[PDB]
């Protein structure tokens, strides 16, 4: 989850999210460098009483400041697209889970074997147990096996929603009539939080997502008990 | 087939359209449709700038293909020079 | 006479003045809505109500700022005032149709205000996506009034685009080629081409939403074989060109301001600037699905849209470097308009660069529908389009009015606004990277510090807006009349005096061919 | 014809700066006030 | 293509009148014959209350709310089937 | 033939993020197979793979609506 | 039909200071008044309708 | 630019009045609405 | 007095009455869709027609009767009309995109096929082919009208323009009959939606274009056009060819390929 005064991304919980962190570090360095260069050059242009107001020939220097940005863009696009196609690669999941968005909560279906499904609603602020997080906890968490490739399928039974979990690098829109797929793999046990990420009406801010990542044998027994 | 009955512009153009038409036929351009062609622009052979008043704005494209046009009021009297290239212009009021 | 002049106008200057007044009033509305947003978010918990009232405010904020403040001021206001003067033309090509472009806007605005007064308002986002905006989740008249508001604004701008393109192509001095017209005129021509091509597609999409809502069509409804995502394509096919429409006249005014207060007779690299604006205009039509990287599109389509979007940095970079090269060697005049333009160059660059971050579809999965997007577009809109509007307003106010502003007050105003907008939006990058979603009325507790700071920033910007009104009042109250303006040889719009006569260029300029 | 010159090419009078202050106050104030009163209207509906 | 016709020399009123009466209106006449010749009602198919057809998410703003604007009782079933 | 089914495998026909048609096709295939069998006398057991795949992939409400429409005679796919 | 454009040209070029939308004669003023009355009255009526629609009606 | 001295100079006191009136025209009506928000919500 | 060739237009009320008619039509549609009343809408349609009539009347006064359409002014009007047609093309492009989006990827609700289960399309070789021949023929006859006008031939201009209008009317009547006879409706899912909204806006443009041709017919009867100056006729002909080309795209896309 996010923590107070956080500046950057939530710590990565999945290898893909780790890849995104390093790619963001690379891109932000370039962003910093170019912004700072432009600010510096502005100050340089403005700090001399020397003048030169006659016509200036442009041809030579426009080569520099076309070719240099083109090279920089290529230096961004290459790692960007590598991660894109990595995130797309075939992986062979062990488990498929569906989630359906609704106004205003998520339901989950685990129907590889038995017909397991339940609804997952925000815990009202007045009912939080001590130490629980305002607007983030749910009554029924999305229990999942850690260290395993999971296929998430996402849809909606009413308006648009979007199913997100920032620390896993996931955001898949929930569209009625459409079954969108993403894959999820947590390197660690724990609790990982997300929030509805497409405006969906009166309680858009109040339909969060909580994944609970545990060893397979715990997930199996939990699954059985949820039937 | 064939036959007539459609008026011509000669017959039926009126107002400013007709003035422009009749002037063009005489080779004249009172409504500034054409670009004037430059003289050599010396003080001896200044560009001659018609006006219906005693001043008119000139735009000077000093060199072929300059994208910057140099604009100034030209007043009745002694020829004036473009402030960028010095080419001469003289107002001819009428 | 008053009605003939101000309701029946066929005069490009008076119609420009009408647009500037309309846009200034809209700007107050838009500012009030922005303060309601930030009041709701300025402490954790709920201030106004749930997300419906909150997102009616957000939705109206955006529509007002875009369609009633920026476009009327830049295109209807500076465009009508300056384009005919900068080409020596005696008015617009269609001076009477021009007046209808203006008068469609108060009705368009009335329809938007009606949408927020009836039922529970249109709490849809300015993108108006179905099915939230459809007749089950937004039953009643509010969304239809919003659609009709957009229809009228769209007709206004399409007819205005026809007027500007025709005027700029057809009414220059016969010796003046397109490569002898000023960059602001180019910027308006290209913006008008974008308006002409993109707004009809928006009109098509929102008409389909209207019939899905009222005539039982199902363009966007899966039950009939429709698709919500089709709406998104049609909307963003307009909506990406629209953001270039919002900035291009700003680029044009920045070129004139930087050139003027550098003491230069011309911008650096004129044909490069023309090339860059045309390139940006063209590339702005082939990138729209970067608004759709999380909807489930195939990976090769995501790779194409990532790459095509990033290319626009190259022509845009040529413009930024050319503005810097215009400053180079200048006799710099530190006027208030120059300060707006310098702040523009830097802060626009920052927002353009976070836009390049977002163009990466892999990273956009995590940034999409978060405040990192909000930060990107307010750097280019609140510190780009708005800074160009303020710079142009302070630079050309003496031309339009015949009176001078107090330059010390105008610099104070710039200083306050600069602090305010940066305090508002810079922390929103942190909120975005750390996962705060868009269109939320309240947030998990961890996000409190940057939301508090951001809201405090928005109040500083409010103080700047109030001070702007006083500064305009003080100028009209004191009546310091303009005498001499420098550099008229390369700023033709000043050469008829301040204010110019009702009719200018009754006798056209003399320009020979040589 | 129409009046020309500073203070005459506008639809509002600048002949008295205090009347002008009132007019500008009503003009910009009404635009800034409107969203607050629409919010109130929506709150007092339900 | 050059189509298969032939003239020019001058494209003029006479040529376009020739095309109007010699090609365009004869083609309209032929298609009019073809059409008013294949008219004659088709059998209306069995009514099936498919959920993607006869959509009603809001009543129409005319009539009883349930009839389309150019409703033809012979061939346009209502959501509950053919009327009367 | 033997089981050990865990979940639906990658299917090269549906390699992209939109999996709507994968659910639909396997639903059709199951019910087509099942109709074929219950006729000629044979065993719906041969249809089982399609049944497992569509149950894995398809939202419960989609299956339920499609089942209701088949019973109603309003299912628009060909079975 | 005979060509009466010349007499229309005389009428609409008469030096009488009238704007083109009124220069045909009294019929222009009547049609103008009808149009503007419908527009302004209809606009007031639309504002009444907004007033009506802005509030809940049992 | 050069300009004439003000035709109708606006003294510092006059500017203080114009600035005060301008700020109050924005702040009072919104302040009234926000002060009475609870009144609105409760109702 | 001016010494350029452009037109300074007298101050005019029609921009304002046009803008207000737009307010009345849109608020009128809202009232019709949500408050069961046609009143505002009928006022808006009436003031809209009044505005268009008086505005274009004044343009005729300014040109035929006052002589303000110099060649430079006409050239601007040519660009204006071309740009207007371009915006109309892009408007139709949105509906063609909707049609191809839905028909190339038919969803499960349709049966996963195009045309959808339960849709029985019109035969494109019957009335739709007839309407194609009708608009193509009208494109030939309007070209004859244009050449007759340029050659100074009043009678054959009028004959050809009358034939063009008659064909426009024939198309509209055929299309109205086919709308009544069609066994599917606008509420028949995305097939009906795309079919009727796209051909419906096309039919509206045929009516607009026919009205514009009729205006030209009566102006021609009153001798307004000269053999060299007749931009209103040229504009109506360009608009008419645009309506014909949109029909050809609809016929190939929706009636034929989409059947
Ligand atoms: C109520 C509406 C009011 C309209 C104004 C009426 C003013 C009457 C004043 C009479 C003095 C000079 O010559 C003139 C000729 C006028 C020709 C009018 C054509 C009328 C439309 C007919 C359309 C039929 C099209 C259908 C094709 C399919 C048919 C299917 C059956 C002069 O005169 C120039 C004036 C005309 C130029 C501007 C015309 C703009 C016309 C459009 C406004 C109306 C829109 C209707 C279109 C929508 C569909 C009906 C004198 C002429 C008066 C009659 C004008 C009728 C216009 C309608
Ligand atoms: C425009 C800066 C803070 C930072 O370390 O940000 C780091 C990253 C995330 O990084 C991490 O994950 C590790 C964080 C390290 C923690 C160390 C503690 C830092 C102390 C707390 C900082 C207080 C923040 C100030 C709060 C600021 C409130 C306003 O966040 C971000 O990317 C924010 C993304 C910003 C992208 C816009 C770039 C604009 C550049 C303009 C500068 C040019 C010249 C400046 C000079 C500009 C002069 C005009
Ligand atoms: C004035 C308005 C404006 C402008 C000009 C832009 C310009 C750009 N925008 Fe922006 N954008 C918006 C307004 C604008 N945007 C809005 C409103 C939204 C949100 C819509 C909504 O959902 O409501 C948005 C959303 C948006 C998204 C969607 C993100 C999401 O929703 O998840 C993306 C993604 O690619 C994007 C990218 C860019 C890019 C690459 C540019 C480029 O044009 C920027 C190019 C400029 C530079 C790069 C800086 C100058 C260049 C140099 C100094 C050269 C060297 C630089 C490099 C080598 C990189 N924008
Ligand atoms: C031009 C566009 C523009 C501008 C200028 C602004 C300016 C501001 N915006 Fe907004 N905003 C949007 C367009 C804009 N915004 C859009 C498109 C959205 C997305 C909507 C959606 O999600 O659907 C958005 C969303 C948005 C949000 C996110 C809401 C959410 O996700 O829940 C927030 C929150 O802080 C915000 C705040 C502000 C603030 C505090 C300002 C302030 O900086 C404003 C300060 C005041 C000014 C800048 C004055 C403006 C007036 C003039 C310039 C008149 C000048 C007068 C003369 C020239 C005479 N905006
Ligand atoms: C040649 C013969 C036909 C000619 C054209 C006839 C009508 C054209 C009218 C306008 C067309 C514009 C689109 C309106 C949308 C739908 C009309 C589609 C064409 C049509 O007429 O569709 C009819 C339905 O009309 C209906 O719903 C309701 C029809 C009336 C309601 C119109 C609602 C207003 C539409 C809003 C317009 C917004 C425009 C914005 C433009 C902005 C541009 C910048 C089909 O009838 P049916 O009974 O369903 O099926 C036949 C069964 N036997
Ligand atoms: C949901 C319902 C929404 C309804 C919204 C409706 C809103 C608008 C109400 C429209 C009222 C229109 C009244 C007639 C306007 C005629 C304009 C015209 O004809 O303008 C002409 C120029 O535009 C030209 O040519 C070429 C351009 C002609 C455009 C004609 C009008 C188009 C109006 C609709 C545009 C829709 C765009 C659709 C495509 C997306 C002439 O220009 P003027 O400056 O007048 O004169 C110049 C003088 O020299 C002439 O002698
Ligand atoms: C480059 C443009 C290419 C356009 C056409 C691509 C058609 C691809 C389908 C090929 C046959 C199978 C499907 C694509 O659907 C669709 O409608 C595509 C619909 C067209 C969208 C085109 C965007 C441009 C619109 C303005 C012109 C999923
Ligand atoms: C909704 C209801 C729509 C109802 C139907 C409207 C039908 C359009 C009628 C237009 C009549 C215009 C008559 C004025 C005219 O045609 O004016 C001509 C100028 O063209 C000009 O402005 C050309 C100006 C007109 C362009 C009009 C194009 C159609 C616009 C229709 C609205 C679009 C709606 C879109 C809906 C999606 C006059 O110049 P000339 O002809 O050279 O004559 C001069 C010679 O006589 C001198 O010798
Ligand atoms: C986001 C934009 C708004 C920014 C913040 C505005 C700053 C507010 C300025 C003051 O506004 C006033 O505040 C008073 C309180 O100080 C209110 O008086 C209220 O409270 C008083 C004191 O309790 C009573 O005397 C009054 O009757 C009662 O109306 C008064 O109505 C309101 O106009
Ligand atoms: C200017 C913006 C206008 C917004 C328009 C909203 C639509 C209003 C139409 C409603 O009109 C009302 O309907 C009532 C019940 O039928 C009755 C009443 O007498 C009538 O007035
Ligand atoms: C040829 C054309 C106009 C030159 C003129 O007639 O004045 C110029 C103007 C801007 C130029 C372009 C811009 O300077 C940007 C690019 C700069 C690179 O150095 C070459 C390609 C590049 C894309 C240039 C190609 C070409 O020289 C352009 C397109
Ligand atoms: C996004 C749009 C489909 C819109 C729709 O669903 O209605 C589609 C239609 C044609 C597509 C393009 C064409 O298929 C051509 C290219 C194919 C490449 O594999 C991706 C880029 C590529 C340039 C495509 C991008 C995108 O998928 C496009 C533009
Ligand atoms: Cu569900 Cu937002
Ligand atoms: O839109 O960027
Ligand atoms: Cu974009
Ligand atoms: Mg989203
Ligand atoms: Na809050
Ligand atoms: Na011709
Ligand atoms: Zn020179």
Author numbering:
A (entry chain B): 1 to 227
B (entry chain F): 1 to 94
C (entry chain A): 1 to 514
D (entry chain L): 2 to 47
E (entry chain G): 1 to 84
F (entry chain H): 7 to 85
G (entry chain J): 1 to 58
H (entry chain M): 1 to 43
Anything the authors wrote about it?
pmcMammalian mitochondrial cytochrome c oxidase (CcO), the terminal oxidase of aerobic respiration, reduces molecular oxygen (O2) to water, coupled to proton pumping, providing charge separation (membrane potential) and proton gradient across the inner mitochondrial membrane for ATP production by FoF1ATP synthase. The O2 reduction site of the enzyme contains two redox-active metal sites, Fea3 and CuB. Electrons for the O2 reduction are transferred from cytochrome c on the positive side (P-side) phase of the inner mitochondrial membrane (inter cristae side) to the O2 reduction site via the two low-potential metal sites, CuA and Fea. Each electron transfer from cytochrome c to the O2 reduction site is coupled with the pumping of one proton equivalent from the N-side to the P-side.
In the Fo-Fc maps of the IO80 data set, two clear density peaks separated by 2.00 Å are discernable at the ligand coordination position of the oxygen reduction site located between Fea3 and CuB. The nonperoxide oxygen atoms, OA and OB, were located at 1.76 Å from Fea3 and at 2.30 Å from CuB, respectively. The occupancy of the oxidized-type structure in the helix X region (residues 380–385), 0.90, is essentially identical to the total of the occupancies of the resting oxidized and E-forms, indicating that the water channel is closed in the E-form. Significant negative density at a region including OB of IO80 and the peroxide is consistent with a shorter (∼0.4 Å) CuB-OB distance of IO80 than that of IO20 and higher peroxide occupancy of IO80 than that of IO20 although positive electron density cages at the position of OB of IO20 are not clearly seen in this σ level. This Fo(IO20)-Fo(IO80) calculated with IO80 phases for monomer A indicates that the CuB-OB distance in IO20 is significantly longer than that in IO80 in the map, confirming a shift of the oxygen atom (OB) toward the CuB site upon the O to E transition. Upon this transition, the CuB-OB distance was shortened to 2.3 Å, which is close to the usual coordination distance. In fact, both the occupancy of OA and the Fea3-OA distance were not influenced upon the O-E transition. The simplest interpretation for this experimental result would be protonation of the OH− ligand of CuB (introduction of a positive charge to the ligand) upon reduction of CuB2+. The present assignment of the CuB site of the E-form as a Cu1+-H2O structure is consistent with X-ray structures of several organometallic compounds, each including a Cu1+-H2O coordination, in which the H2O ligation was determined by identification of the hydrogen atom positions. The CuB1+-H2O in the E-form completely blocked electron back-leak to Fea33+.
